[PDB]
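[recover] target loaded
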């Protein structure tokens, strides 16, 4: 076992191995506190996240287990992965805190889009990396569900990683509460992200769920006959069909000046009918990315056992299962 040292950083206390030095808080939220640190063993700057109230309830306990299982499974250049996971606890009884460690990512796409106006070549590279990580994630039967600029970490090399796998980036089927949305919800988010990088403006800055939908339908037009035929909720259908019908706009006109290849990709990404959205694997082959697309270098993920998501367990079982995952963690080769 390693040796730990203790310090209070912004109200929260931190107990971590000596190997992690010069802890410096980077931001907080409902997820937990994150500190930047220097890792003496590897020589790398790392981010250390302390989970907040990881076993407060069954929801929190399952969530803590899900995140650890999820992060332990991601080994991909464009997805946040685990360098280390630890707890100061020596036994299961005293297990109450979980610490996650990954390569420090200095910025996100919000501090890059609002602070600049991306050139078409930088858009190609950034979006290509997103789709490359999304192919890997989707190959594991995982849906991100919450893709947005602040969930895409970027460093100075413009290397990008997905993390955390009104919402201006949410697919309309979710705005409408369709219970069977598929992985193409993530593609819709990518489309909204790409559009923002090209124009510097939020594509759909809705103020609520209703306003969000009107903004979407203003651009992509109201659902056609084939799409309405797939809506079971009578309420949702009645609403939709009762709106002042609107036509699909010419994307080449909305995104005037942009690269015609980028516009064609947006049209295939921002399709209302989810059965017809381009998939991540298909987008990677789109001509827009011809400069970066390497089919032998866009790998898929090993199988991911999600059977736990339907289990109804007590807090101590979720806690014990999490402890099992901390103890059994094997770091990645240096
Ligand atoms: C929208 N917000 C959602 C929450 N978030 C983060 C960002 C980071 C992070 C910070 C810096 N470098 C890398 C990752 C981490 C994190 C995950 C595992 C280990 C350590 C840290 N967890 N959550 C910030 C963006
Ligand atoms: F106005 C809209 C906006 C989006 C959709 C939609 N796109 N993909 C799936 C759906 C959908 C929505 C509600 N119920 C079933 C399916 C349907 C109508």
């Amino acid at each position: 076992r390693p040796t730990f040292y203790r310090q209070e950083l912004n109200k929260t206390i931190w107990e971590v191995p000596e190997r992690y030095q010069n802890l410096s808080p980077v931001g907080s939220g409902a997820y937990g506190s994150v500190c930047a640190a220097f890792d003496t063993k590897t020589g790398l700057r790392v981010a250390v996240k302390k989970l907040s109230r990881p076993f407060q309830s069954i929801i929190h306990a399952k969530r803590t287990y899900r995140e650890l299982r999820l992060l332990k499974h991601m080994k991909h250049e464009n997805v946040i992965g685990l360098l280390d996971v630890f707890t100061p606890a020596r036994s299961l009884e005293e297990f109450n805190d979980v610490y996650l460690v990954t390569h420090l990512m200095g910025a996100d796409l919000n501090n890059i889009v609002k602070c600049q106006k991306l050139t078409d070549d930088h858009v190609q590279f950034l979006i290509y990396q997103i789709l490359r990580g999304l192919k890997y994630i989707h190959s594991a039967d995982i849906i991100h569900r919450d893709l947005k600029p602040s969930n895409l970490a970027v460093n100075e090399d413009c290397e990008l990683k997905i993390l955390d796998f009104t919402r201006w980036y949410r697919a309309p089927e979710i705005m409408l509460n369709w219970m069977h949305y598929n992985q193409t919800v993530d593609i819709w988010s990518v489309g909204c992200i790409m559009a923002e990088l090209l124009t510097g403006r939020t594509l759909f800055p809705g103020t609520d769920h209703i306003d969000q939908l009107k903004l979407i339908l203003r651009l992509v037009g109201t659902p056609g006959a084939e799409l309405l035929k797939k809506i079971s909720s009578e309420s949702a259908r009645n609403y939709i069909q009762s709106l002042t019908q609107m036509p699909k706009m010419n994307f080449a006109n909305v995104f005037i000046g942009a690269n015609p290849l980028a516009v064609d990709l947006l049209e295939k990404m921002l399709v209302l009918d989810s059965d017809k959205r381009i998939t991540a694997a298909q987008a990677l082959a789109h001509a827009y990315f011809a400069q970066y697309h390497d089919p032998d270098d866009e790998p898929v993920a090993d199988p991911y056992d999600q059977s736990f998501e339907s289990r109804d367990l007590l807090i101590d079982e979720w806690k014990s299962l999490t402890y099992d995952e901390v103890i059994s963690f094997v770091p990645p080769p240096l």
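[recover] notes: The CA atoms of residues 177 and 236 lie 9 Å apart.
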